[PDB]
Amino acid sequence: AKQSMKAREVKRVALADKYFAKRAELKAIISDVNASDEDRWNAVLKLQTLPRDSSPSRQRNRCRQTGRPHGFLRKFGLSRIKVREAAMRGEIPGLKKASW
Amino acid sequence: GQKVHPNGIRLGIVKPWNSTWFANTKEFADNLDSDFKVRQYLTKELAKASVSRIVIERPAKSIRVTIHTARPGIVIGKKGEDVEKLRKVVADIAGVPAQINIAEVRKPELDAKLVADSITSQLERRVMFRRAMKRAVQNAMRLGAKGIKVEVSGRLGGAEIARTEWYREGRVPLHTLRADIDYNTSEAHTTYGVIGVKVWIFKGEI
Amino acid sequence: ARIAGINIPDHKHAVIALTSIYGVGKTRSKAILAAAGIAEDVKISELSEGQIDTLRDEVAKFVVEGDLRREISMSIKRLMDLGCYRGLRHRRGLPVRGQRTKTNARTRKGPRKP
Amino acid sequence: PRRRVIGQRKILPDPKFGSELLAKFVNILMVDGKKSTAESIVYSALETLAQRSGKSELEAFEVALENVRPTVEVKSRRVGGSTYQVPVEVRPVRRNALAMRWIVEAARKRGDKSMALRLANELSDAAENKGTAVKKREDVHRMAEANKAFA
Amino acid sequence: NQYYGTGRRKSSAARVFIKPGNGKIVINQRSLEQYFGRETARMVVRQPLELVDMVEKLDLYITVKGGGISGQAGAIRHGITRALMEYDESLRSELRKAGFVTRDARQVERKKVGLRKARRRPQFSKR
Amino acid sequence: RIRIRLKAFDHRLIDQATAEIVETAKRTGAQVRGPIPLPTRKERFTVLISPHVNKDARDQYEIRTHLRLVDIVEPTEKTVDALMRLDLAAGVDVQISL
Amino acid sequence: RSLKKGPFIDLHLLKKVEKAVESGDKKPLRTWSRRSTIFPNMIGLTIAVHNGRQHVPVFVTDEMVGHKLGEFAPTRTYR
RNA sequence: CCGGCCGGGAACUCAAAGGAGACUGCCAGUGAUAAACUGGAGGAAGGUGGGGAUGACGUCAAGUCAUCAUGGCCCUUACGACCAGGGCUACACACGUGCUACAAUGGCGCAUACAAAGAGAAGCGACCUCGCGAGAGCAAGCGGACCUCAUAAAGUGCGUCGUAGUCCGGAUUGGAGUCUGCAACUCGACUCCAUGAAGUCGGAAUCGCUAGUAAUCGUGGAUCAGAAUGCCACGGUGAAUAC
Numbered sequence A: 001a002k003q004s005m006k007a008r009e010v011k012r013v014a015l016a017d018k019y020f021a022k023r024a025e026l027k028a029i030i031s032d033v034n035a036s037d038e039d040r041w042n043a044v045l046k047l048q049t050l051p052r053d054s055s056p057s058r059q060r061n062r063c064r065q066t067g068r069p070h071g072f073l074r075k076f077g078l079s080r081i082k083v084r085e086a087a088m089r090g091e092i093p094g095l096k097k098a099s100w
Numbered sequence B: 001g002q003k004v005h006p007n008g009i010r011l012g013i014v015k016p017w018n019s020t021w022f023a024n025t026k027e028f029a030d031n032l033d034s035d036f037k038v039r040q041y042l043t044k045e046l047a048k049a050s051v052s053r054i055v056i057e058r059p060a061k062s063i064r065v066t067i068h069t070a071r072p073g074i075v076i077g078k079k080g081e082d083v084e085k086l087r088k089v090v091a092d093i094a095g096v097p098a099q100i101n102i103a104e105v106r107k108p109e110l111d112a113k114l115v116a117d118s119i120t121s122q123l124e125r126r127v128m129f130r131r132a133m134k135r136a137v138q139n140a141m142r143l144g145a146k147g148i149k150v151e152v153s154g155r156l157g158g159a160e161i162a163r164t165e166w167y168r169e170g171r172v173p174l175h176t177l178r179a180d181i182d183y184n185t186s187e188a189h190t191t192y193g194v195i196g197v198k199v200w201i202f203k204g205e206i
Numbered sequence C: 001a002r003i004a005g006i007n008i009p010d011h012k013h014a015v016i017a018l019t020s021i022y023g024v025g026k027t028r029s030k031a032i033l034a035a036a037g038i039a040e041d042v043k044i045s046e047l048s049e050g051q052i053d054t055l056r057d058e059v060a061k062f063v064v065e066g067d068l069r070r071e072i073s074m075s076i077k078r079l080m081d082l083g084c085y086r087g088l089r090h091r092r093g094l095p096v097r098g099q100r101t102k103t104n105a106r107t108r109k110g111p112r113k114p
Numbered sequence D: 001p002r003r004r005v006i007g008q009r010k011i012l013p014d015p016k017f018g019s020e021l022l023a024k025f026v027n028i029l030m031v032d033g034k035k036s037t038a039e040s041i042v043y044s045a046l047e048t049l050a051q052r053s054g055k056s057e058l059e060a061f062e063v064a065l066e067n068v069r070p071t072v073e074v075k076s077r078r079v080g081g082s083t084y085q086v087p088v089e090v091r092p093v094r095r096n097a098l099a100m101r102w103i104v105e106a107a108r109k110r111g112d113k114s115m116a117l118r119l120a121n122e123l124s125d126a127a128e129n130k131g132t133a134v135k136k137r138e139d140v141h142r143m144a145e146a147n148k149a150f151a
Numbered sequence E: 001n002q003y004y005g006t007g008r009r010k011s012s013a014a015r016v017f018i019k020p021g022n023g024k025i026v027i028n029q030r031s032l033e034q035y036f037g038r039e040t041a042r043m044v045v046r047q048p049l050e051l052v053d054m055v056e057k058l059d060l061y062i063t064v065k066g067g068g069i070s071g072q073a074g075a076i077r078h079g080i081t082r083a084l085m086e087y088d089e090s091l092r093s094e095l096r097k098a099g100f101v102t103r104d105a106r107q108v109e110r111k112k113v114g115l116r117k118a119r120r121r122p123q124f125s126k127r
Numbered sequence F: 001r002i003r004i005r006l007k008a009f010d011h012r013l014i015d016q017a018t019a020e021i022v023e024t025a026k027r028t029g030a031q032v033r034g035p036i037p038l039p040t041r042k043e044r045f046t047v048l049i050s051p052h053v054n055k056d057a058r059d060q061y062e063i064r065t066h067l068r069l070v071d072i073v074e075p076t077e078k079t080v081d082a083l084m085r086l087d088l089a090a091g092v093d094v095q096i097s098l
Numbered sequence G: 001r002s003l004k005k006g007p008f009i010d011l012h013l014l015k016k017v018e019k020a021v022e023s024g025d026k027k028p029l030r031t032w033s034r035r036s037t038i039f040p041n042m043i044g045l046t047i048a049v050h051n052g053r054q055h056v057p058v059f060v061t062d063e064m065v066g067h068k069l070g071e072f073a074p075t076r077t078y079r
Numbered sequence H: 001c002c003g004g005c006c007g008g009g010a011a012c013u014c015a016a017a018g019g020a021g022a023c024u025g026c027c028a029g030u031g032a033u034a035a036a037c038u039g040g041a042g043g044a045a046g047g048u049g050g051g052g053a054u055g056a057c058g059u060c061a062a063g064u065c066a067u068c069a070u071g072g073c074c075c076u077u078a079c080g081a082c083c084a085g086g087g088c089u090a091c092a093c094a095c096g097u098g099c100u101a102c103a104a105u106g107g108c109g110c111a112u113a114c115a116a117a118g119a120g121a122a123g124c125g126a127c128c129u130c131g132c133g134a135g136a137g138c139a140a141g142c143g144g145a146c147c148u149c150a151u152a153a154a155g156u157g158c159g160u161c162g163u164a165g166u167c168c169g170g171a172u173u174g175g176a177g178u179c180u181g182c183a184a185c186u187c188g189a190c191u192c193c194a195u196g197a198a199g200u201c202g203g204a205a206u207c208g209c210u211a212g213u214a215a216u217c218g219u220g221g222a223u224c225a226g227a228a229u230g231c232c233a234c235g236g237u238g239a240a241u242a243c
């Protein structure tokens, strides 16, 4: 729960989607079957500048309330310890405990 | 940690839900986060006014928030100005229209969370934990309580160590998967340290 | 039985002999028999030399044992002269098929000395 | 265990010809659950034994059943502490299973060709009393004759 | 005329239609020797008929699926008994003694937490 | 024409929500088809519980998501006149597809 | 193995050599981009490849054609 | 144009709901005629029939203040903040759980059967072109009992291999490559071509299992840009013994 670390995800996500990660104009065009022209170098010409801060592969895709890199679930938004506590409390529509 | 939460096992069987909205696996996290944030903001802003439980619902993205309290006179405030104001806050935080519904509890000693909040407020006053717990349980049993179990753990009374004390009056069948019970927990950060409470109250059979 | 001048893969199918040959294994045996026009269900002790010389010529196109280890040694010289991390790992005389060495490399690091 | 004293399951006979003996004989050699090949090989071996002996299968082995099946076993109840042989009566309920186990142990030997050739060969050797499964029959007899009237 | 038999061992759904006049067999438009006539359970589908009549009195049309070979083969061994109702009294009071009528409700127990399998406990150390 | 496919959480809720639809479209809506069971998904997965340690502690939570179909065949206008902005059994998700 | 269309290189590494090759580079170069490979232009160099505590100076030979800089950075001290 | 493809039926599998039934219910007998237990017929289902979550007071002042919070305390232009690279993958060595093998109830090649369960929208991606191949281009359809992942695999037969480290087995590196992500050696995975060990089924000692279980065969889900033999699940074939 390091504030700073949580902020790190914040500054990561604040520019990833605002920038090349969705604005993938430069790489998308370049890395293809087109001519082996200057475009090959041009590709990394932008990436050297690119804030490393911003790309999807970078972000950990972790929880939000706790800020915990592990146990997170891509489908709920929180860690295991918190999602279970909310589940057996009732704040998870239609989710309950079953057996086989 | 071997005792199961005796409501997670009864939610989809006999107990009512609290976050009711169906959707696809694209907005689950966002909706649940908005709900959690607004709900903790509500339990922070209206704590002193008996919020017994707070249930949520999201129909076609015009959400409903039901708040079961015991002091609606102060919740509504002046003709509901505070209500319509909190309606702005919920809509701002959730990005959607909001509809608030205030429900009233008759005897606040019917809500485990409410009695736990009472005990939490009492134990932050250098009060006698026994004179609080026994008084609450007898207050419940007099008006009628087919079962009650109230446990308190921590540095109670300055024990300086991990100490727990529970009081039982009636039948509290936490193993029978047929009944309806009320249960919740609270925490008091007395200057000694924190003190946790566990309150189960058993009235229903079906 | 006589291909390469040295190897005698006798009593081996037309392809089993080539697989047993030093220099090539499973695939080049079939490639050789295909480019030469022979089946892969008969031993080598039945084929005459009029075809064995052709098999010899057909295998004389790729690198051979006499040059297999020479190319390997050339790559090893490249590594040792570069001094790369791989060159060092090889010059320390350790097993060679991959990357992991700490706790499971016993196969070519031999048994424990102490 | 200690509470229950239940017995053994029922045996499902062969779909070819009713033989719980042969069903157990096959289940003893059965391994890993890959039963298609096991059945395909055992039935082939047995239909070959059929002509190897001149008679059908259910009787081809009935001649070596006695050669293999002994009449004694060993159970060492500690006497103030004891762990050596102590002769006892063998249970015929599972003596057939013990014989099926010994004969397959022996058939795994003679190993040069496939099973279909070697298990039938070992059963024929047992019929002429020439198998290690037939020798186990006397081995246990020797081990039992040593300490008579023990318990 | 026409009699329907349902079958179900080990998730294996079997759907049988039996008629009088012939005694042929067809498994999902396939023959017995075509699918498993010389494999495991190559005869269990005939035992219920071999008990009363198999050769040419009652001809069959089968559709089995939903699992393994042995599964579908026991599914037929069952569905035959369910289709055998034209003389239900004599087809049941006689066969119930030999079996072939039970569902054999056997289900593979799920992968169990902690356990590496349905029943195997992982390996210990004790030290 | 209106391929009606709805998704809900509970069966005692999806049935109660289909009841009013299959009553409205019959009193006005000209003989819709028959409610269809549509096999369902539950998302049976293993999650985790204990803090820090005891990997052998797990929980098996599920979300039984029921599915149903109606497939109104008559393209009458009273169908839409009755299905005009109504949401019953809040906590579910229906859809009007043609 | 690596990129199929265009060997990946960094600009801080490229530009410092491409333009100084006309001068001879006269000196080492502190490389913080060890994730790059070599090409016939980058030989004759005396570059200090970062390896943690410091930058190891290395002379470049024509044999280092398709190898990276960190390929020989000894962070494996081991005595 | 045999594709339920098109009419056609809701006969049938299947489907998601609502119910049915099973209970010692009935008969025999050792037994305090009690209870109970072996048995017997009926019995889709036999003795809590499937199993599953359910962990009672409590014990280790067990573990966790690095899920989270709070006390008490320390620091604070620093125990705080940020940037690049290395590390946790460094290994003479100890130990522990798993995948692979030690082969002929088996390896190799042809064709050849049926699963079940779950996933899939800045995602699953048929078809089709190219490429031995890893994948690369065109790219519908599908937010889904319809479109995709996605071909189950051991098996079935045939032919070969014929007891040798042998067509076994496959490992810690060569060379050429394929994808991921800016980025693939320090430190990803994958194919191909090539070399090919140890191990000939294992000492003391020790581990699991009472049935659709053990044993194995594959399949999918998480996490995830990529990254398992591991974790969690699906179903396939299929034991022995419990004196």
Ligand SMILES: [Mg+2]
Pocket (backbone or CB within 6 Å): C093, C094, C095, C101, C105, C108, C109
């Ligand atoms: Mg080594």
Ligand SMILES: [Mg+2]
Pocket (backbone or CB within 6 Å): H062, H063
């Ligand atoms: Mg401890």
